[PDB]
Amino acid sequence: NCDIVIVGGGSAGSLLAARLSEDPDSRVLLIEAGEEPTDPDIWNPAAWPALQGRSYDWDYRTEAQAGTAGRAHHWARGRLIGGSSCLHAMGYMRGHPSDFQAWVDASGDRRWGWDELLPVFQAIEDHPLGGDGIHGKGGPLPIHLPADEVSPLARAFIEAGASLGLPRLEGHNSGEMIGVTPNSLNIRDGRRVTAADAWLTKAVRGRKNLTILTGSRVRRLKLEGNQVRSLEVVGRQGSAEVFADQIVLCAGALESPALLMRSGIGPHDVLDAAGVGCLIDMPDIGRNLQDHLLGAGNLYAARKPVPPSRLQHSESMAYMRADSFTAAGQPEIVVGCGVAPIVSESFPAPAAGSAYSLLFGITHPTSRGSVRISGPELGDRLIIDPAYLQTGRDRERFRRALEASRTIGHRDELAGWRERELLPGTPNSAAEMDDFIARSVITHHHPCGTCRMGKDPDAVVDANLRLKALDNLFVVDASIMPNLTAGPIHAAVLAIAETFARQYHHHH
Ligand SMILES: Cc1cc2nc3c(=O)[nH]c(=O)nc-3n(C[C@H](O)[C@H](O)[C@H](O)COP(=O)(O)OP(=O)(O)OC[C@H]3O[C@@H](n4cnc5c(N)ncnc54)[C@H](O)[C@@H]3O)c2cc1C
Ligand SMILES: Cc1ncc(CO)c(CN)c1O
């Protein structure tokens, strides 16, 4: 209610609603644009792709991308309690320690380093290796290490990678991320487990100091001096003004910057062009946009029927250096085993069961894009330019990734499954490879960076996640990430939320 308002009930928001309200002297209101879940397919891990295009998916469309053969891309996003966590591939990857070293350099604060994050990840995790001093034990989020249920295709892929020199890992989360392993998953008893499941339990929801408001969109934050004084909330019925002492934005990589721009906080020139009065000129709001790509894909005809995944279809990412299968350290590329024959819209889909794809990507793209509001209204679509493949480094590294994928794909360890390669076949030059890659890449679903945390004067938030231009507004979601982690970012978003919860309880 009165003390703190959380905008957006997604991954970070669900965690915060629970954690902030642990203080009985704190009144917490959670405002979510979507509805509570009712669709049962949501908890079926193997149904995650079918979830897209449904009612609770924002379904943004990017600008045409010159670096991906002029293709425009669809960006699925959760619009319901639990957010993008409902739509997940449910992979759990903390990231690599060096990923977070970059956050430390950017933020000027040690709290964002692997060593300090370690107890934070551990507080979040309920992991089967919990107790080893590295992984968490007894935390709200189950982490599952698949073994028996791993697809024989995925095991064959893992063997192919292992034969090449990649070490065998138990999940990606020990601080060592390069190697071969089934992906760790947020699954318990065969059921997907979301942020909302883990943190917004029946007990938490029963707290008299926690109020959850659904089907309600925050349209503008209203200012008085150097503070946010109230929020304008738009519901199925009409609009209403909500007051608060502290405001935390958890609307995610697209919607957090959009809310700020609608409120007249952002690039003066962007707001002008959107017809929004400028109250605080912050040039970096909406900028620094990053995302991961996967090439869809190194497609193989199967020598025998490919049986449906007993997990989540994309069962094993192999992170590695771009120039060697034996070298250790921070990942540069990734090749993943897709039990489903996944291809972009640029290719015809093979019959089900008849093919599998190896997905290939780069782990730390240097390209940087932007999100801008097109007008003042909730209904005015965002202008999203991820700037995919715009740097020479990103393009060169993706050649390395495709090359790594084909090397793994053609190993004897996969001869039991492989009939022959369907894609890319025979690219005989850099340009031909570049063209196939540009036609094949799709989003890995990890948008972030649009409200970047930094120690420099024009960063959007400081190391405490406070919007630099105001006293009582915080941004606590994927938008603050200075840079992408090597792999999927949900663990990182949750780590961001937990460290902010700890900071709030520490200073109040
Ligand atoms: C299909 C898919 C699969 C994925 N798979 C994985 C995976 O396997 N592993 C992994 O690590 N990551 C994965 N991700 C990414 C991960 O889910 C997100 O990075 C993470 O959930 C980001 O959380 P967040 O709190 O920043 O935003 P979100 O979880 O997206 O939450 C934003 C919430 O705020 C609400 N909201 C937005 N605007 C407003 C407003 N104006 N007023 C009120 N409410 C608002 C939205 O409805 C939403 O509920 C996947 C993403 C997608 C789309
Ligand atoms: C397209 C896609 N494939 C596989 C995975 C497995 O982690 C993810 C999750 N980001 C994904 O988005």
XYZ file of N, CA and C in Angstrom, residues 38-123:
258
model
N -4.369 -18.967 -15.449
C -5.406 -20.006 -15.409
C -5.109 -21.112 -16.433
N -4.332 -20.767 -17.458
C -3.939 -21.705 -18.508
C -3.010 -22.779 -17.935
N -3.439 -24.054 -17.985
C -2.684 -25.172 -17.401
C -1.423 -25.531 -18.192
N -1.408 -25.213 -19.487
C -0.234 -25.448 -20.332
C 1.021 -24.748 -19.782
N 0.809 -23.662 -19.033
C 1.891 -22.859 -18.456
C 2.874 -23.678 -17.596
N 2.354 -24.673 -16.875
C 3.176 -25.469 -15.958
C 3.746 -26.740 -16.583
N 3.330 -26.999 -17.814
C 3.864 -28.088 -18.616
C 5.131 -27.610 -19.328
N 6.313 -28.073 -18.863
C 7.614 -27.600 -19.380
C 7.743 -27.714 -20.904
N 7.210 -28.812 -21.444
C 7.272 -29.130 -22.871
C 6.296 -28.307 -23.724
N 5.498 -27.462 -23.082
C 4.511 -26.661 -23.797
C 4.929 -25.196 -23.973
N 6.107 -24.833 -23.460
C 6.560 -23.433 -23.467
C 6.493 -22.678 -24.816
N 6.868 -23.328 -25.942
C 6.764 -22.577 -27.202
C 5.316 -22.280 -27.618
N 4.386 -23.194 -27.337
C 2.976 -23.004 -27.693
C 2.350 -21.822 -26.946
N 2.937 -21.481 -25.798
C 2.513 -20.333 -24.990
C 2.561 -18.996 -25.747
N 3.487 -18.881 -26.701
C 3.675 -17.631 -27.446
C 2.469 -17.308 -28.337
N 2.156 -16.021 -28.470
C 1.021 -15.595 -29.279
C -0.318 -15.719 -28.564
N -0.294 -16.246 -27.339
C -1.499 -16.319 -26.513
C -1.785 -14.980 -25.843
N -2.870 -14.936 -25.074
C -3.406 -13.695 -24.504
C -2.457 -12.937 -23.552
N -1.647 -13.682 -22.801
C -0.773 -13.107 -21.773
C 0.674 -12.909 -22.257
N 0.830 -12.724 -23.567
C 2.130 -12.489 -24.197
C 2.065 -11.156 -24.946
N 2.951 -10.227 -24.579
C 2.974 -8.878 -25.158
C 3.211 -8.902 -26.671
N 4.091 -9.801 -27.113
C 4.372 -9.990 -28.538
C 4.820 -8.706 -29.265
N 5.944 -8.132 -28.842
C 6.488 -6.929 -29.476
C 7.091 -7.280 -30.825
N 7.181 -6.295 -31.712
C 7.784 -6.505 -33.019
C 8.941 -5.512 -33.185
N 10.156 -5.999 -33.444
C 11.282 -5.068 -33.603
C 11.240 -4.407 -34.976
N 11.955 -3.294 -35.133
C 12.234 -2.773 -36.473
C 12.914 -3.834 -37.345
N 12.818 -3.682 -38.665
C 13.619 -4.486 -39.594
C 15.106 -4.385 -39.240
N 15.837 -5.506 -39.249
C 17.274 -5.468 -38.912
C 18.196 -5.702 -40.102
N 18.939 -4.663 -40.485
C 19.881 -4.720 -41.604
C 20.916 -5.833 -41.428
N 21.283 -6.093 -40.179
C 22.258 -7.133 -39.880
C 21.672 -8.537 -39.887
N 20.342 -8.658 -39.936
C 19.734 -9.991 -40.067
C 18.857 -10.053 -41.308
N 19.460 -9.716 -42.450
C 18.815 -9.791 -43.760
C 17.524 -8.983 -43.828
N 17.487 -7.857 -43.122
C 16.294 -7.023 -43.101
C 15.094 -7.613 -42.373
N 15.290 -8.733 -41.670
C 14.194 -9.361 -40.923
C 13.805 -8.560 -39.676
N 12.501 -8.463 -39.438
C 11.958 -7.925 -38.195
C 11.698 -9.120 -37.294
N 11.769 -8.925 -35.989
C 11.715 -10.052 -35.081
C 10.557 -9.920 -34.097
N 10.022 -11.050 -33.661
C 8.959 -11.028 -32.665
C 9.542 -11.277 -31.287
N 9.211 -10.416 -30.326
C 9.725 -10.545 -28.959
C 8.618 -10.884 -27.962
N 8.492 -12.168 -27.636
C 7.508 -12.630 -26.653
C 7.839 -12.088 -25.269
N 6.832 -11.612 -24.543
C 7.043 -11.154 -23.170
C 5.844 -11.499 -22.282
N 6.108 -11.945 -21.056
C 5.038 -12.262 -20.124
C 4.185 -11.061 -19.717
N 2.858 -11.208 -19.830
C 1.888 -10.215 -19.338
C 0.864 -10.883 -18.405
N 1.294 -11.158 -17.176
C 0.496 -11.868 -16.170
C 1.377 -12.020 -14.939
N 0.769 -12.391 -13.811
C 1.523 -12.580 -12.580
C 2.603 -13.630 -12.837
N 3.862 -13.248 -12.632
C 4.971 -14.136 -12.932
C 5.758 -13.681 -14.148
N 5.129 -12.847 -14.979
C 5.811 -12.221 -16.102
C 6.386 -13.180 -17.134
N 7.647 -12.950 -17.519
C 8.303 -13.735 -18.573
C 8.685 -15.099 -18.040
N 8.655 -15.219 -16.713
C 8.913 -16.485 -16.029
C 7.824 -17.522 -16.365
N 6.642 -17.055 -16.777
C 5.546 -17.972 -17.193
C 5.816 -18.628 -18.563
N 6.590 -17.895 -19.370
C 6.850 -18.192 -20.782
C 8.237 -18.818 -21.007
N 9.065 -18.765 -19.961
C 10.389 -19.411 -19.838
C 10.686 -20.654 -20.665
N 11.964 -20.857 -20.983
C 12.444 -22.198 -21.305
C 12.935 -22.856 -20.009
N 12.729 -22.145 -18.899
C 13.109 -22.538 -17.534
C 14.575 -22.956 -17.282
N 15.485 -22.550 -18.166
C 16.900 -22.789 -17.948
C 17.381 -21.902 -16.821
N 18.234 -22.446 -15.953
C 18.835 -21.665 -14.867
C 20.357 -21.601 -15.035
N 20.855 -20.426 -15.417
C 22.287 -20.197 -15.598
C 22.663 -18.916 -14.863
N 23.473 -19.009 -13.810
C 23.899 -17.801 -13.095
C 24.642 -16.845 -14.027
N 25.513 -17.403 -14.860
C 26.430 -16.593 -15.634
C 27.832 -16.968 -15.188
N 28.844 -16.356 -15.804
C 30.244 -16.624 -15.481
C 30.793 -15.465 -14.661
N 31.664 -15.750 -13.677
C 32.210 -14.708 -12.789
C 32.714 -13.460 -13.520
N 33.368 -13.648 -14.664
C 33.865 -12.520 -15.446
C 32.731 -11.619 -15.960
N 31.544 -12.196 -16.183
C 30.377 -11.406 -16.608
C 30.108 -10.328 -15.573
N 30.238 -10.709 -14.308
C 29.894 -9.824 -13.207
C 31.042 -8.881 -12.855
N 32.272 -9.270 -13.199
C 33.397 -8.358 -13.066
C 33.128 -7.089 -13.863
N 32.522 -7.248 -15.037
C 32.156 -6.108 -15.866
C 31.093 -5.233 -15.193
N 30.200 -5.845 -14.412
C 29.212 -5.069 -13.651
C 29.894 -4.241 -12.569
N 30.951 -4.809 -11.979
C 31.714 -4.134 -10.926
C 32.435 -2.925 -11.501
N 33.143 -3.146 -12.605
C 33.818 -2.066 -13.307
C 32.815 -0.970 -13.693
N 31.656 -1.364 -14.216
C 30.654 -0.390 -14.660
C 30.049 0.379 -13.485
N 29.753 -0.336 -12.406
C 28.999 0.225 -11.281
C 29.875 0.874 -10.223
N 31.134 0.435 -10.155
C 32.048 0.916 -9.137
C 31.743 0.323 -7.774
N 30.970 -0.765 -7.758
C 30.573 -1.379 -6.504
C 30.780 -2.906 -6.493
N 31.515 -3.383 -5.480
C 31.890 -4.790 -5.299
C 30.700 -5.728 -5.132
N 29.563 -5.168 -4.720
C 28.373 -5.970 -4.430
C 27.864 -6.727 -5.644
N 28.282 -6.271 -6.823
C 27.813 -6.819 -8.076
C 28.805 -7.817 -8.644
N 29.814 -8.175 -7.850
C 30.804 -9.157 -8.265
C 30.403 -10.557 -7.848
N 30.950 -11.560 -8.535
C 30.622 -12.960 -8.273
C 30.729 -13.336 -6.782
N 31.814 -12.909 -6.134
C 32.059 -13.257 -4.732
C 30.937 -12.772 -3.823
N 30.475 -11.541 -4.041
C 29.407 -10.982 -3.206
C 28.051 -11.510 -3.650
N 27.922 -11.823 -4.935
C 26.666 -12.385 -5.446
C 26.480 -13.827 -4.983
N 27.587 -14.511 -4.701
C 27.545 -15.927 -4.305
C 26.521 -16.218 -3.180
N 26.586 -15.478 -2.051
C 25.556 -15.713 -1.024
C 24.151 -15.330 -1.493
N 24.049 -14.446 -2.486
C 22.737 -14.047 -3.010
C 22.118 -15.171 -3.844
N 22.884 -15.705 -4.797
C 22.438 -16.869 -5.567
C 22.048 -18.006 -4.608
N 22.930 -18.304 -3.662
C 22.666 -19.342 -2.668
C 21.367 -19.136 -1.885
N 21.054 -17.892 -1.514
C 19.789 -17.614 -0.821
C 18.581 -17.903 -1.719
